[PDB]
Write a protein that binds this ligand. Sequence first.
Ligand code: K
Ligand code: K
Ligand code: K
Lengths: 472, 462, 472, 462
Amino acid sequence: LLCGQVQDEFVVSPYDHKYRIWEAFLVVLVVYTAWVSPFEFGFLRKPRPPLSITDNIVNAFFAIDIIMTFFVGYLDKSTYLIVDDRKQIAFKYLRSWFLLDLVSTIPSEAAMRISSQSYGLFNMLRLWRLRRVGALFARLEKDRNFNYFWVRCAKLVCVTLFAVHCAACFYYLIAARNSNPAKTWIGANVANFLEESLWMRYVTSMYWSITTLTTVGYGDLHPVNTKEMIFDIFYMLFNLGLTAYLIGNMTNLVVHGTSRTRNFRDTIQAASNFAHRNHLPPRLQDQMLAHLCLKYRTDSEGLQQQETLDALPKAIRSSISHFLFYSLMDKVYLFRGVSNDLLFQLVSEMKAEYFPPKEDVILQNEAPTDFYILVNGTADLVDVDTGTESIVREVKAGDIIGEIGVLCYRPQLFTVRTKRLCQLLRMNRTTFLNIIQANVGDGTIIMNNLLQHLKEMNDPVMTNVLLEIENM
Amino acid sequence: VVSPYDHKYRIWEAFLVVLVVYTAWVSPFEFGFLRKPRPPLSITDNIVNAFFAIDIIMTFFVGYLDKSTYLIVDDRKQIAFKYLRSWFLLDLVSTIPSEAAMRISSQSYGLFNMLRLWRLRRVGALFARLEKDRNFNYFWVRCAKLVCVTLFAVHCAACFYYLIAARNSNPAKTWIGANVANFLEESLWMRYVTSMYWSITTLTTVGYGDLHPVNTKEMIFDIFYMLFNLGLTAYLIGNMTNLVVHGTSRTRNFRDTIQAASNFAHRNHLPPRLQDQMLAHLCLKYRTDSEGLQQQETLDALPKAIRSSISHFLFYSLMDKVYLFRGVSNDLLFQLVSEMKAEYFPPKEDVILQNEAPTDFYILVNGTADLVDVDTGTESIVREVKAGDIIGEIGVLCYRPQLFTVRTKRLCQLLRMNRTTFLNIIQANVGDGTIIMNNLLQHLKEMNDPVMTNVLLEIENM
Amino acid sequence: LLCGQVQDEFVVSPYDHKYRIWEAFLVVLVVYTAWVSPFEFGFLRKPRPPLSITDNIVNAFFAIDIIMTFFVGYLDKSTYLIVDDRKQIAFKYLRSWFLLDLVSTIPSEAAMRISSQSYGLFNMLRLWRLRRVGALFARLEKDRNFNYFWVRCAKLVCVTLFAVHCAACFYYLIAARNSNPAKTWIGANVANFLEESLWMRYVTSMYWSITTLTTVGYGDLHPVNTKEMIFDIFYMLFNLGLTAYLIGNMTNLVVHGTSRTRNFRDTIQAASNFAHRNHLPPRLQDQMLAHLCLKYRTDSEGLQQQETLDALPKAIRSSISHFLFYSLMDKVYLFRGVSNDLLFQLVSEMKAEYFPPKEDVILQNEAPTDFYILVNGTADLVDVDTGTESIVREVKAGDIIGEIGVLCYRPQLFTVRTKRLCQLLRMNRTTFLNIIQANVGDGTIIMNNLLQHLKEMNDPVMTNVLLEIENM
Amino acid sequence: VVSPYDHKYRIWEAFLVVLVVYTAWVSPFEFGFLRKPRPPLSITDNIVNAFFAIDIIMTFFVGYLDKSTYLIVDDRKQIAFKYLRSWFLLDLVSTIPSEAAMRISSQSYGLFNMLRLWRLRRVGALFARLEKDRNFNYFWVRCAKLVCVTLFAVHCAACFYYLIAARNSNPAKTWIGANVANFLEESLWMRYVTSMYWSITTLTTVGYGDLHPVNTKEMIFDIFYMLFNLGLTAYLIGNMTNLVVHGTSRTRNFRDTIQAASNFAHRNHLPPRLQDQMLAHLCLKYRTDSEGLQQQETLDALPKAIRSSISHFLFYSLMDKVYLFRGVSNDLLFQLVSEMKAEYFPPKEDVILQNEAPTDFYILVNGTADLVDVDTGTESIVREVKAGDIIGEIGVLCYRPQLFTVRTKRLCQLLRMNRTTFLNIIQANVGDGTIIMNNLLQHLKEMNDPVMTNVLLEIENM
Ligand SMILES: [K+]
Ligand SMILES: [K+]
Ligand SMILES: [K+]
């Protein structure tokens, strides 16, 4: 019960802290300009002081960014190194985006000087600064410290808010830039717009955009002339896909999060209900559920370890195995006095594994393929040669399992049952023979083996007698 | 001192849940539609506050479970000094009677009454507990939680929107003032119904057209309300999709399993005499729920040792009743029962053919079978075999083609043990082989059926 | 290319035909009454001739069904047999549903005779006949001949249509049963209802119900008084969940249908793009994609066969194996002259398998565990003992593979490579020894083996020479 | 006779696609808004009809692919007798000019012009072909097909609804007559725009309120229209959900793989010196797309024989350039290259440590590495090793602790050969061991680095 509950539960680097803390500051300005540019494009025809001053400030900041970005190295994809070549940095920045960044920094006063018909379509050029938020969202998605669900939710919220704002600004622009204002969507409802506060018109247009996007459609503020009808047709066509995309993303976030818990939940629910019904055992039913809980943990760790390995080079896997098991392997009785390099080679190919309690790692009278070594827990040696399952000896962490059968090429002697959650490490017979063959120190192993057979009475002696007869 | 899980405390929590629901409904209503204590309701508010005061004084005497506690921590400190440091002040400010707050200030009625919403932690904890239960489905309580939060959102939005309408001078030029002439001179029931109708119309994205925002404050509120509505609707649709996907997998799995089996049968061009039988067996396996496939899907995941004990416990009383195993041993029977395979057979099917090669002998557990013998086109019934009886054992022990065809009558569950495995086990324990042989010999005493068998064997028995 | 395209591409039984063709006929009457009862409950207060006559006819038909169902046996869940016991049939029908079926058959004239205030709520009792459509849908879902997608779509369509009809009838009933008709949802729009055609009122109410369900909400025909507001509140509250359920079902039908296409699609897309890029081979890249196509077919069939088997009793699996392989194994050279029963026992435990072309079923110098037999295709015998991969002999369908190593308990002789899609069947060494031990016919096998060693020159002879000294 | 896949025929089909789109747009428009041939458009209709007549007379000369055909069937019969028996009559009735149908009857203009919609089989076949392509995504063409059918449904509904409005006497008391005073006395453009606006408003479930059905015919049509709309919206949402689910699995897989690796590293309490390296390796392997993980995910699924030939072809020119293998053999090199493991290393890392146990020697394929030697805290660069060169071979062949630390400069791909495997391979072919040894000995002639090694080995070489 307790276990089951637990289971359920002067250039600069592009990575400097002083540069990352400043690049992220430009996201605030990107948000500000993304809000301002459609509002200025729709509701304003001439630069007003309280907005023009801030626009000039932001343009100066982005010009500072442009003049600074020439001193920032990048990471080559074919080298994974900082380029640190001012010749290459400039010829990459110019080819990637330099004129687009430049045109998005000219103050609106200069645009008006060129032509008064401008300053509407010129402010929309400042939307080019929206690549920074996309790059930031990509980095956040490819980052571990930030939750995927909240990142996706924030991205969706930003997208829908920007769409609402842009649509509202465009639709109010269509309303205002029209003779006979009484024949417009807002002129047929208020009948006195272009005279009251800008805040009222902004909130009215935003309310219309929100009602149209969420498909509420109250009925006030509806298109009258043909241009508004066409724009609203296209807007609703976009909104259908936008809502479908939002629903799909929400479904995707809702699923695959609790999905991998449900396999465990139902595979244990079947066991629990089968135990509860059909002559419920007193305590055996409690034993089996703990075994299932341990197995679900064992295979997951046995798979995560297998997944993270076999994808790394041998040079680092060998180092990891040496860090984990070389110290423990020094206590192995067979490898006593052998050359030190052979120990390293053996450790580098040990293939650690895990086993649930009451599991038969080796069964009696089987083909000799592998020999095991204990790391954690303990196991009991049993044999059915006498007709009964009686234990012979208990092996603790630090002894070999079934080494007699593999060395002498004969079927195993005793069935090994792990009375506890045991971590083992097994290496094949063919690999052992290959390693021994490409070496000169191998007599010590057989001397240690034969010495060990003497310490056990009459169980190995028959095998020892056979080996002595077979050696001659 | 009392411990959790007690039937005098869980019932008390379940009773406090309905009071929490009452508070969650009432507090926004008094915040929006009410100004004075309104004795029609302040007495009930005081009653609920007294009940929650009883709870807050009672909670000092209840234990809890820590990360590694022994299922209970029954002391004064470490529970009094834990509760006071988590939410004591919030649970105390949210139970002060509204009558007292009037003396402090007369304009804080609704604002102070909205503090009672802190009691929703009870509902949150209940939903969290039901999420990790066994008798209740997971997605079916997730959807209930979504429905509850949707209803709460609708009620809160309606109350806030009517508050915005009422707290504005010149009641005309408002969402309710433009439709209803003088709403302020009408019953509270109809105004509440109208506000709730508007809230539901906005939430379900119907938007009939009546009761729409007029001034800027209502538009500003409604924009955020609609954004929250879109988010909530998307989340609810996702949860419903997950519930549907994970709530009908059994039928799809059965369908695709049967389709794959039929494709396999067709690929090798098996005769229909086999296809019908395998289809019937598979339909029986995937139709009997919690007994047919459950036993296999459970015992398969055991490491041949725990399931051995399971079969020993589940098949010992029936095993000891057979005549073949009378006085063999108390561990040989353990090995025997651990070396059996459980099988099921649909009715009107034969498990043993007459004059077949003797390879298996069965032990009946449930149901009945008829020992059908044929002389010349006559399926004369010899006798009926009941539960807890052995069949087909005389052909495998005494090597000979099978005597009688065993056709099943009802839905039966059989235990099958291989001849080779039984011979290997018997050869390993020769001492019980004599017991088995004499038990078989003494049983062969019925009318003229095995009489020649004893004599024929005695020819080679010297 | 071609292979890849192919891979992508007087009682009666309750099962009598004359009874199934009549029970399905009652579904038409169930649909008719499911349409009529809400319409009669809302739009009609007294039994009109053209509807009362048909209602009496349908009631007579259902009374005939009631009086006939006493002569139909059922299938017991604990027996899976037709009960055929008229004593038990009646005591099951009465306990399950007899009074509910009876009350849903009384003609409406009798209900009016009891009280004129009735005949509204009495017609809604006829909705009890909706269990038949539910049972039919369950049977269709549990049936193979009918597509799951279309059954689910039809069920959803029926549910939503019934909801629309019931809501429309209830809402028109609320409108009509009210004094001062000018203060109703339909009285404020038409202002002359209760006087024009019933068809107009029915279609108007249905149009309102459809507009409310699909969340269009044009604006005409909206609630006015409090009762209509409450009913509409509850109706839209139900509609939200109904639409969520429909969307969830549609998503579930859309996914899991093309899902198991995409694993193959992307696992072959990766291979195709890797072959196209990075020094595309002339024809080797064509060879590997065919191997992947064959493997995707091989493991699928190898899994479907494994899934359908191991779930059936041994008595039928043995019969299937005997039908498939007993005739073929008669040609096996080792089992010539052995007792016939031993052949049956061997056939019962052969565990047939499949292998893609250019696959090594047995590799040289491995532990002797299994020996194989060919069924289809052919394989080539290769050995690296000479330092090169040179074929020695080609084995056709009907010969054993690696039988020398398993019998003599020595490492295998030659690596076996399947030059074509080969179906094999392998059985273990321990099983073979157990089968041989529980028998008396075994000398024939070893004599046949030794005779076979003489037909091959100097390759088995060294092993045969060792065996001659090993036997002594 | 011409065969499919020809660039003079596929282009022709792609050009007919836009004509099919034009017909699909125009035919409902003329059915609804038009009565007479309207020469402003009948000339274009006749042009398109002539083009489709050219196509229908041309299709007698194009082959096809059957179930087991040899990619083409170029005859007169079995293609003429197949096309004439499948859709010849439909493709001929759907190309008769509308001028001819006027003589038959003047009231069948729109009904006969609606028969041109049969040409949508071209778009259907195009979408089916694009579904089973390689350069185009599957869900991204499914969504395009859904968008196209949604647009077609909107257009058809708008045309039908305006036809219903116009074909009714007393134009007032209609959905457009109640809003627009005299719609029949206004331009076709504005009427079409209004009808399309109503159709889009109904489809997106906005329902502003203007242009609503008045009489019973419009209500009856609109009920079925809304039901179809609900079905189409549900299907489109399902398809979009499937696209989203199957379009972002790569990022989730990378995230969960990195999370699992970090959990494994933390569980065993590895030092950071290993955690950073393994995280860098995993990020590099999951970041390099189409070259890093693609090679492993491809070669892993090969049965050790085809991938052997792949490595033989991909690693023979570079292998033959090494000084160690000059005149060794033409099959031993095949075995060696088939017995190599491909590995990748991020820059600024060391693959061989100085004075380590000699166990592997590498062959560089791409990138550069620096042979770093340290005397006393001085990482003096000895020399740079380029692509197609062997490293660390002097320590494994001549058993000795490694001489120089090989630190990588760029992103490199290496081939690793195990000392034990190489020794076993060499021992199997002794005649080439002499060649390998003398090739090694002759190379040992640089300045003072291996001079003592040659002498020291010659001490034991007698
Ligand atoms: K809507
Ligand atoms: K709406
Ligand atoms: K509306």
